[PDB]
Amino acid sequence: CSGDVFTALIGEIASPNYPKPYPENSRCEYQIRLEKGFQVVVTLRREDFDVEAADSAGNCLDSLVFVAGDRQFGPYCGHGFPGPLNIETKSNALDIIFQTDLTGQKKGWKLRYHGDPMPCPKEDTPNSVWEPAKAKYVFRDVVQITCLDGFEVVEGATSFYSTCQSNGKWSNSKLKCQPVDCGIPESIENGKVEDPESTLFGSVIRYTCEEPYYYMENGGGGEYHCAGNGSWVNEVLGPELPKCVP
């Protein structure tokens, strides 16, 4: 046969000279190369499938098989199609091999391929919501995941954006929603902060001073809490820390 490479997103091809009998004792090599992220879905009219059948052993002599990376689709032989009309290779690249033997004198085969975007499946939202929230996400689709109230994205915020990739995996799957961490309390000169059980959201700490050498200058300050800002804050002083004075 010796066909050229097939770049086009959609196409079709048959048992050469089709529907003349397939020339015995020859090998047919056909190369489809899509662009990565696009599986080759193959459609074959069973009435467009005629091949010299297998023996008692079920061993297919005349053979048409498909090479999809580690996946092998076949081995196919006979009159009338054995598998389904629709085949998902789950591959961007595909090779069609047709092996001929003796008394070709069978109509042959004819098929079409259409490329289909490889889906990036669902990661169950632990504490988050994806937008847009739909039923099936595929290649190139873009999503904004937004962390809830009390949760933040580690390696930074509360919102991030990810595509579905050519590998069928979401970009930045690594990033997840932890409860927000204001960190360890910063310490004040002439003052002691008594560390708590949680540096997380909702937690409360209170500063104290070296008594009776240094004192408040607060106005009711001292007590701080971890807010969604990722910072300990006071209702009066806010993000800033007390000053201890003689």
Curated annotation (Swiss-Prot):
Known outcome of mutating E52A: Does not affect association with the C1Q subcomplex
Glycosylation sites: N229
Outcome recorded upon mutating D101A: Does not affect association with the C1Q subcomplex
Paired cysteines (S-S): C1-C28, C60-C77, C120-C164, C147-C177, C182-C226, C209-C244
Domain CUB intervals: 1-116
Domain Sushi: 118-179, 180-246
Residue positions binding Ca(2+) 3: E52, D62, D101, G104, Q105
Listed name of the protein: Complement C1s subcomponent heavy chain
